[PDB]
Amino acid sequence: DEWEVSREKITLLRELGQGSFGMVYEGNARDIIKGEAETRVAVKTVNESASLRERIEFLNEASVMKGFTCHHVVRLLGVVSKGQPTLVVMELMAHGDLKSYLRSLRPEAENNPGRPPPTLQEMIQMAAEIADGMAYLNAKKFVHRDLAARNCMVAHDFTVKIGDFGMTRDIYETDYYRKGGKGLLPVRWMAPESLKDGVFTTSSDMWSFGVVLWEITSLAEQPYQGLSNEQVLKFVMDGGYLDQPDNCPERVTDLMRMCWQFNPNMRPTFLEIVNLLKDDLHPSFPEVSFFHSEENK
């Protein structure tokens, strides 16, 4: 209702790439944002051949997003749910996902924009933005379960935001989500206790946040390269973790190691990350952050 957008206002322009449950498109949306006759948007759709499970998860993801208002979380703008097909309209992120962005900054990248890799200050800013959006998600009582550079998105001014919630689960009642069994899973990002007990908490998100820091400082190499998926499962459950990338600033190394404590109780919280980094950020941060907001209570 409040979210419903009239279909005639949405025009699909081109493919951005296959999302969790179907193709995402760049589009044009008329009269969706007050003050803009027409806005360039991202539009998520469901594959016609999607399984019942995927159709359910797609709709549930859109539904979860309705509850979020955070500068560091990709914004839901509207839904077209009258007639066919369902369109999920969101904030277009001008520089796409963080993994693509990082890979483009490699010296040998064919798509190098003519900029060097991120500086220490830029890395710190990314870290704080990611952590701020995650702290918001946690305060909203959801666990992300799939935090990774590929699921963070980069805006026109290079602000990083949490951007994909295909595995996100409500934890209001218990503070954890548990699910064992077989699955196509982001093994290289997962905490030892998630792999062992199938348990997902804000601490297991923190583990993945460490891996995101590793991605930032390695320009999104594959974690545990030379190990198969099954070897990563064994390695990490037995107390293994990632080595430091070449020329990694010590400050980021220090954070990574805290994120990879075997015992989840020992890892930092996302608020603690923002707090640690808070004096080293762009002056706009307190004006837009969840951390510095009245809601952070």
Partner: peptide, 14 residues
Amino acid sequence: YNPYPEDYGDIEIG
């Protein structure tokens, strides 16, 4: 928006 199929593996957890 780029998908990364190699970032997932068929494993068993829990």
